[PDB]
Amino acid sequence: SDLEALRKKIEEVGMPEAVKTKALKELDRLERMQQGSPEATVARTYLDWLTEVPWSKADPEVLDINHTRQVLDEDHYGLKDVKERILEYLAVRQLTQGLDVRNKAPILVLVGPPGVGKTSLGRSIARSMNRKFHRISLGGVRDEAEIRGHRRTYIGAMPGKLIHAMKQVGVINPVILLDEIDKMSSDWRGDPASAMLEVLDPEQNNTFTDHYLDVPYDLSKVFFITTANTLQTIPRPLLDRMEVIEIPGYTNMEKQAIARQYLWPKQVRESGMEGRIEVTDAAILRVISEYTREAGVRGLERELGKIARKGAKFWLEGAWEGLRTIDASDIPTYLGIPRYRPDKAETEPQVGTAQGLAWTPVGGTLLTIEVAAVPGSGKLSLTGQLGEVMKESAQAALTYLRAHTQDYGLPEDFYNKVDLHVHVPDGATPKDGPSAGITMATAIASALSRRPARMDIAMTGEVSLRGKVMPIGGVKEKLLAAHQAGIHKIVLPKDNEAQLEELPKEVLEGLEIKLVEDVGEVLEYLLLPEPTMPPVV
């Protein structure tokens, strides 16, 4: 009577008319499963979903931003303006919920380096709305292999892994998540972006065309959270209807915060030791700096585990009572020898030198431009694997000085008898871009005038010929690098006064950001008023 039990469950689940006739034809067709079977064994994976797929299994959608906020921060730190845009996508649905919402609304998409929080939010955003998070690992699909299930052309007509999200969950109003959509390639037959349109259509996400599940499934509420790292490979006909929210990356303060309570324990327990060893907050800072050189945090936790594991072996090597503590005075005994020096400022004013700030995709760096003035013919040597653009900024600063030899008390004929030389340690890393011109403008001015330039001041500003300081890019990462180096005075163009707000409130208080517009402001600020070394001529 099992061939009749298929009636019992198919007639009782659901059922919408859109999927009613889809069984009334095959409710009888598959009963020939004694011989073969071309069309009787290929229908057990037909009802076993239909007899098991949920219908109308609803859930109380959270209409309380405090239900979300008070638990989102319960899982993640910082990302304030980021979390500001997150809620900004949330309550747009609950303003027209039920009807006049599912018909048209943008799609949330998260982009950021793969170390920073990208998937945990999915479990965080879903649990905060009484649904079921699901991490469809799309990394591995770049072709027309499985974006919609096969036909009934074989016995292995297992549904599409996409619609299996509707199978794995037991409700009809889930939170379905994707991973790294830019891991595709739409350059051959069966464009893998075509189906995703219908899957993500803010108009027909209630019709899921397939090849074995011939009926386009009707899914009323399917909350979506899309993740990626590169906007480029993301399909074009999909990107154009996504209110994408970027995920920036961490700072050396929050990097100490997360690992203080999240990464360290969630790696200590799994390290056998369930509270029999603990690392001090000061010690983490070393591991924060001297071994962590990643934008995200995926690289960080691996070190702490390596501490725990190699720490665990010490127990079997020799026991110790209670919990053993680990401070910044014993870390190398666990992780080995450091791999990245810190970048600490120098304090004592030096001749013809300045503190340059450089942006890098993994943070910020404090570079030290240094120049020399030797009796020569007037050449200009720009050394240190400098980029072609920066070399232009060097003369740009130098030429400005040449027309103002009296105004800063420079040598009258330094264009002619003083052969400069600009170096930027280290010598192996390609340094590029016009922003550092304000600094160069300083050291060159100092080196000629023999008045030292104080180093407790950071500076960065692109220079123009007649002398106006122009805006730069990446003020956020640079300043953050400057503070963690221990600098408390910064010089910055007037234009970038706007983007000063992105810094945390604390660092902004720590720095006395001098805001300038012309170089004449800087050279009075930075140069010692007295001559300490003899000139060239």
Added chain:
Amino acid sequence: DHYGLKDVKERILEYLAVRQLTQGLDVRNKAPILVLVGPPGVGKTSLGRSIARSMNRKFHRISLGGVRDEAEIRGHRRTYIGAMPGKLIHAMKQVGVINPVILLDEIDKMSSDWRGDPASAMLEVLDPEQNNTFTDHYLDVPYDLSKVFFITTANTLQT
């Protein structure tokens, strides 16, 4: 539809005249299909949907830039136990109007790799004496492509 463009719309009012004023002849005789240009601030094909809507017709769209294979507009032979025809007839299917206007969707990045160049496919329907003489793999029968008023518009005119 939009605001301004008094120097824009008429350049199609000076285009549709060749069809109404002369029907049967000079209405499908290899007419010059449109093209538009402007800064990258204005919504340009936003006028597109308001062309059929302006003439009461309907509208469909297939990404010709994404048209680079035979699972696209080209046909699927009837030998198989399952296969879908080209999106040309499918486009005709989703619509209920034999002349569905189609913007040249993203053809601005048109490649011409294997499985039929999307240009040769247009040659059949675009040619005024060939559109009535289509040919599928889904079928074999010369299928009369009456009209698909392509609205060509992009900011690339080289590849």
